[PDB]
Design an enzyme around this catalytic site. Sequence first.
Site, PDB file in Angstrom:
ATOM      1  N   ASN A 219       6.634  -1.225  -6.607  1.00 56.26           N
ATOM      2  CA  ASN A 219       7.721  -2.049  -7.150  1.00 56.26           C
ATOM      3  C   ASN A 219       7.937  -1.882  -8.614  1.00 56.26           C
ATOM      4  O   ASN A 219       8.897  -2.454  -9.169  1.00 56.26           O
ATOM      5  CB  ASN A 219       7.491  -3.511  -6.812  1.00 56.26           C
ATOM      6  CG  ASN A 219       7.593  -3.759  -5.295  1.00 56.26           C
ATOM      7  OD1 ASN A 219       7.735  -2.817  -4.500  1.00 56.26           O
ATOM      8  ND2 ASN A 219       7.646  -5.010  -4.913  1.00 56.26           N
TER       9      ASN A 219
ATOM     10  N   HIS B  78       4.316   2.975   3.689  1.00 58.83           N
ATOM     11  CA  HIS B  78       5.052   2.857   2.450  1.00 58.83           C
ATOM     12  C   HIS B  78       4.761   4.089   1.568  1.00 58.83           C
ATOM     13  O   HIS B  78       5.459   4.295   0.567  1.00 58.83           O
ATOM     14  CB  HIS B  78       4.621   1.626   1.676  1.00 58.83           C
ATOM     15  CG  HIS B  78       5.707   0.863   1.003  1.00 58.83           C
ATOM     16  ND1 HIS B  78       7.038   0.963   1.330  1.00 58.83           N
ATOM     17  CD2 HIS B  78       5.627  -0.134   0.069  1.00 58.83           C
ATOM     18  CE1 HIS B  78       7.749   0.089   0.608  1.00 58.83           C
ATOM     19  NE2 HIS B  78       6.911  -0.587  -0.160  1.00 58.83           N
TER      20      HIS B  78
ATOM     21  N   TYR C  85      -4.241   2.632   0.132  1.00 56.23           N
ATOM     22  CA  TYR C  85      -2.825   2.775   0.497  1.00 56.23           C
ATOM     23  C   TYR C  85      -2.399   4.145   1.012  1.00 56.23           C
ATOM     24  O   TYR C  85      -1.310   4.310   1.496  1.00 56.23           O
ATOM     25  CB  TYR C  85      -1.965   2.464  -0.734  1.00 56.23           C
ATOM     26  CG  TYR C  85      -2.002   1.062  -1.201  1.00 56.23           C
ATOM     27  CD1 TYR C  85      -1.158   0.123  -0.676  1.00 56.23           C
ATOM     28  CD2 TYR C  85      -2.820   0.677  -2.256  1.00 56.23           C
ATOM     29  CE1 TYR C  85      -1.086  -1.154  -1.201  1.00 56.23           C
ATOM     30  CE2 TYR C  85      -2.805  -0.628  -2.760  1.00 56.23           C
ATOM     31  CZ  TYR C  85      -1.931  -1.531  -2.212  1.00 56.23           C
ATOM     32  OH  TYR C  85      -1.846  -2.797  -2.712  1.00 56.23           O
TER      33      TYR C  85
ATOM     34  N   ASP D  85       9.953   6.055   2.116  1.00 57.72           N
ATOM     35  CA  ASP D  85       9.947   5.477   3.453  1.00 57.72           C
ATOM     36  C   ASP D  85      11.233   4.695   3.691  1.00 57.72           C
ATOM     37  O   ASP D  85      11.757   4.056   2.785  1.00 57.72           O
ATOM     38  CB  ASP D  85       8.743   4.580   3.597  1.00 57.72           C
ATOM     39  CG  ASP D  85       8.694   3.435   2.573  1.00 57.72           C
ATOM     40  OD1 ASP D  85       8.696   3.696   1.316  1.00 57.72           O
ATOM     41  OD2 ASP D  85       8.534   2.258   3.044  1.00 57.72           O
TER      42      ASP D  85
ATOM     43  N   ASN E  72      12.035  -1.800  -2.384  1.00 60.79           N
ATOM     44  CA  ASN E  72      11.690  -2.320  -3.685  1.00 60.79           C
ATOM     45  C   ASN E  72      11.263  -1.252  -4.680  1.00 60.79           C
ATOM     46  O   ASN E  72      11.242  -1.492  -5.880  1.00 60.79           O
ATOM     47  CB  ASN E  72      10.640  -3.417  -3.552  1.00 60.79           C
ATOM     48  CG  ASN E  72      11.226  -4.665  -2.894  1.00 60.79           C
ATOM     49  OD1 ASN E  72      12.415  -4.944  -2.988  1.00 60.79           O
ATOM     50  ND2 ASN E  72      10.400  -5.373  -2.196  1.00 60.79           N
TER      51      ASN E  72
ATOM     52  N   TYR F  35       2.288   1.426  -8.948  1.00 61.17           N
ATOM     53  CA  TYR F  35       2.562   0.672  -7.720  1.00 61.17           C
ATOM     54  C   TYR F  35       4.072   0.698  -7.397  1.00 61.17           C
ATOM     55  O   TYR F  35       4.928   0.853  -8.266  1.00 61.17           O
ATOM     56  CB  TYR F  35       2.016  -0.798  -7.716  1.00 61.17           C
ATOM     57  CG  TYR F  35       0.480  -0.799  -7.684  1.00 61.17           C
ATOM     58  CD1 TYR F  35      -0.264  -0.595  -8.857  1.00 61.17           C
ATOM     59  CD2 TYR F  35      -0.192  -0.879  -6.510  1.00 61.17           C
ATOM     60  CE1 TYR F  35      -1.656  -0.548  -8.788  1.00 61.17           C
ATOM     61  CE2 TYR F  35      -1.560  -0.809  -6.469  1.00 61.17           C
ATOM     62  CZ  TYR F  35      -2.276  -0.655  -7.634  1.00 61.17           C
ATOM     63  OH  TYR F  35      -3.671  -0.547  -7.560  1.00 61.17           O
TER      64      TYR F  35
END
Lengths: 193, 193
Positions: free
Chosen positions: B70, B22, B17, B95, B116, B68
């Site tokens: 969320n 994001h 990631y 972001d 989120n 993570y």
Amino acid sequence: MSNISLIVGLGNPGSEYAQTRHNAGFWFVEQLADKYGITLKNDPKFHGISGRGNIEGHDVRLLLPMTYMNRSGQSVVPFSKFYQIAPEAILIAHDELDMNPGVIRLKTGGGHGGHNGLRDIVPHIGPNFHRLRIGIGHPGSKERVSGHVLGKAPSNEQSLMDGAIDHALSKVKLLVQGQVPQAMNQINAYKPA
Amino acid sequence: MSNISLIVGLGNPGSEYAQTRHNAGFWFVEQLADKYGITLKNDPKFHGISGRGNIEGHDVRLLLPMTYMNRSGQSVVPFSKFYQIAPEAILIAHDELDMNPGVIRLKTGGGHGGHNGLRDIVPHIGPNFHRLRIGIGHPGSKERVSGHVLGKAPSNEQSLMDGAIDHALSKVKLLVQGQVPQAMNQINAYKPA
């Protein structure tokens, strides 16, 4: 015994991930649950969603970790320990970069093969669980892997994967009855029509 | 009390990631940490990576949740409670779909705007924290959002975002010195072209 009593599907939680290739295992397990009318419910004690019910005359548990992929052991390990389920009775369904869309195989034992969900499980329960390897294709370099696994497949590739999943669903009876060599033969023979 | 004393960067953990859109917030906070020689260390008590040090004569904490995206509140909420840091002293970098690459803005208050990560924070600490909104652009439609945010930007868009980040980094002195209206004015004036 030889009977598969726990079926785990690997993937990432949330609608953001539900259609991505790395969720192939979730696809399998969700479809299996609904095929037999087994409800999957929130199971926060084991950081997952889980269900139990009758598949072809056997009492089987279904689990989807909600840990994110690379932390799947945080759900699979205490769940299998709490219920005293040996690895030999566990089938884990997962996406496989090393097989093409439309290719599906059952494997017993071995390593993670660079799959980071399996990498979080093998250290804790050992390697001797069964794996339903759902081919997703390999995009052709290491740098492309993240975008491939966290991407949505185009419809032609999705149909190939769905056909393979449908075929494996049809062989779950053999697995829950403990007829693993026969399941392996019949699953691994699949080719798209 | 106007002084920013905690700067959070939102994102997802892991090399898969690290380059994705994001993770814009992580980019900002990692770059800020190294600019001032603040080491970011594993901080498992708060489910993140954190650091503390001197920025322009003030003792500032830096946090990257490792929950993570969320589940970011799982890190930010206990961290801010333990250190007794009020929302008005918190800057959260993230972001922003609704701004283009190269656009960057400092905002105070408001809702999550469908982000989120912020959705997991606002319910627990309320809305009155500051936000550094790093433009990432919006792909055509709701269905394309996941692939955009979990994708790597092309080099031309990455250049625009990096320029905007560098400009914001230059204004951090104003923020940690409690000159927030001036920081807002100076960040929000950035022109990427």
